[PDB]
Design an enzyme around this catalytic site. Sequence first.
Site, PDB file in Angstrom:
ATOM      1  N   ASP A   1       8.107  45.392  15.668  1.00  0.00           N
ATOM      2  CA  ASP A   1       7.836  44.395  16.700  1.00  0.00           C
ATOM      3  C   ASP A   1       6.521  43.677  16.393  1.00  0.00           C
ATOM      4  O   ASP A   1       6.205  43.440  15.217  1.00  0.00           O
ATOM      5  CB  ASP A   1       7.777  45.113  18.060  1.00  0.00           C
ATOM      6  CG  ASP A   1       8.174  44.235  19.215  1.00  0.00           C
ATOM      7  OD1 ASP A   1       9.298  44.416  19.732  1.00  0.00           O
ATOM      8  OD2 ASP A   1       7.387  43.350  19.590  1.00  0.00           O
TER       9      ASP A   1
ATOM     10  N   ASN B   1      19.152  37.495  24.795  1.00  0.00           N
ATOM     11  CA  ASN B   1      18.885  37.003  26.146  1.00  0.00           C
ATOM     12  C   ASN B   1      19.472  35.623  26.409  1.00  0.00           C
ATOM     13  O   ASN B   1      18.893  34.825  27.142  1.00  0.00           O
ATOM     14  CB  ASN B   1      17.390  36.987  26.464  1.00  0.00           C
ATOM     15  CG  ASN B   1      16.714  38.318  26.205  1.00  0.00           C
ATOM     16  OD1 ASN B   1      17.283  39.380  26.461  1.00  0.00           O
ATOM     17  ND2 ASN B   1      15.479  38.267  25.721  1.00  0.00           N
TER      18      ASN B   1
ATOM     19  N   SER C   1      14.972  43.204  25.292  1.00  0.00           N
ATOM     20  CA  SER C   1      13.861  43.866  24.619  1.00  0.00           C
ATOM     21  C   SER C   1      13.377  45.095  25.375  1.00  0.00           C
ATOM     22  O   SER C   1      12.799  46.000  24.764  1.00  0.00           O
ATOM     23  CB  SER C   1      12.684  42.905  24.524  1.00  0.00           C
ATOM     24  OG  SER C   1      12.864  41.935  23.514  1.00  0.00           O
TER      25      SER C   1
HETATM   26  C1  LIG Z   1      12.857  37.903  19.324  1.00  0.00           C
HETATM   27  C2  LIG Z   1      12.216  36.758  20.134  1.00  0.00           C
HETATM   28  N1  LIG Z   1      11.798  35.526  19.447  1.00  0.00           N
HETATM   29  C3  LIG Z   1      12.053  34.994  18.111  1.00  0.00           C
HETATM   30  O1  LIG Z   1      11.569  33.952  17.818  1.00  0.00           O
HETATM   31  C4  LIG Z   1      12.924  35.674  17.067  1.00  0.00           C
HETATM   32  C5  LIG Z   1      12.101  36.379  15.999  1.00  0.00           C
HETATM   33  C6  LIG Z   1      13.143  36.549  14.914  1.00  0.00           C
HETATM   34  O2  LIG Z   1      13.535  37.614  14.581  1.00  0.00           O
HETATM   35  C7  LIG Z   1      13.717  35.261  14.356  1.00  0.00           C
HETATM   36  C8  LIG Z   1      15.141  35.038  14.230  1.00  0.00           C
HETATM   37  C9  LIG Z   1      15.360  33.573  13.643  1.00  0.00           C
HETATM   38  C10 LIG Z   1      14.061  32.959  13.445  1.00  0.00           C
HETATM   39  S1  LIG Z   1      12.977  33.978  13.892  1.00  0.00           S
HETATM   40  C11 LIG Z   1      10.921  37.279  20.753  1.00  0.00           C
HETATM   41  C12 LIG Z   1      10.626  38.602  20.735  1.00  0.00           C
HETATM   42  C13 LIG Z   1       9.467  39.034  21.283  1.00  0.00           C
HETATM   43  C14 LIG Z   1       8.585  38.132  21.856  1.00  0.00           C
HETATM   44  N2  LIG Z   1       8.880  36.815  21.868  1.00  0.00           N
HETATM   45  C15 LIG Z   1      10.036  36.377  21.321  1.00  0.00           C
END
Ligand SMILES: C[C@H](NC(=O)CCC(=O)c1cccs1)c1cccnc1
Length: 279
Positions: free
Chosen positions: A39, A161, A224
């Site tokens: 993470d 989500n 999450s």
């Molecule tokens: C998981 C999520 N946000 C992402 O941008 C995906 C991060 C990732 O694996 C990606 C997949 C495709 C491009 S990047 C998130 C998690 C925690 C906090 N804020 C946001």
Amino acid sequence: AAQTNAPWGLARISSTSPGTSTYYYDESAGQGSCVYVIDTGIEASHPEFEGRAQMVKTYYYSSRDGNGHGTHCAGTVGSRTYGVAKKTQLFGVKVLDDNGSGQYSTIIAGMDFVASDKNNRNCPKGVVASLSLGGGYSSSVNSAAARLQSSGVMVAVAAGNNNADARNYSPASEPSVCTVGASDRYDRRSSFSNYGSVLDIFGPGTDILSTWIGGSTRSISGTSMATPHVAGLAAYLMTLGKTTAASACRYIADTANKGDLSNIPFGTVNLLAYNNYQA
Ligand SMILES: C[C@H](NC(=O)CCC(=O)c1cccs1)c1cccnc1
């Protein structure tokens, strides 16, 4: 053991009914297991972790959690007050920057890191990995999650989500890992939770109190937040000897509360994680 005035999600995973506030669990509490939280990092100095958390890898200029998300998820796995498995060892792998973003190649590297790094850690009861992250479908991301699982790690991943079918997201869509949807305190599917045949289980995901950076706490929502309930549950059950990394997702589904959630689409499992603990 009993923890009164627990966060609702801890109470829910040890109950056959919603609406209670005590968490019941065997005092072994995941001792001898390990959970990797892949993470934004973990604020290991948080008093809630009691020296049981440590950063083991980062892909960025620092291993510090400058976001909070990873610390919150780690807290649901294994913090003293907010955690499912209150005696597990927590290992942080920072694949996401402090804005919560990271490229797929880094996430893949972090999964392959855990598959190897577990051989450098003492986890006699077993190893779990919690992945509260995802993006669009990628066969390479799914394959990395499948490798991690195959290596002997119980992999729990967030469904996403988007209130959409999780088959279009990774690593959520990898069949061989444990894909976790979110529920609320009234046993409704969380409004944002992804769904679909690829889901294996639901866990508490709406309004989840846990640790935050700066030695603080807060309540936030997402798949999450459901994922670390399942990861901590797996560590807890592995310490009890009831299951193994290869079998824990199936065991959790077998022993779940069944048919208790509302607004579950036809063809998505109606299964809510449950520790089956009898005091
Ligand atoms: C998981 C999520 N946000 C992402 O941008 C995906 C991060 C990732 O694996 C990606 C997949 C495709 C491009 S990047 C998130 C998690 C925690 C906090 N804020 C946001």
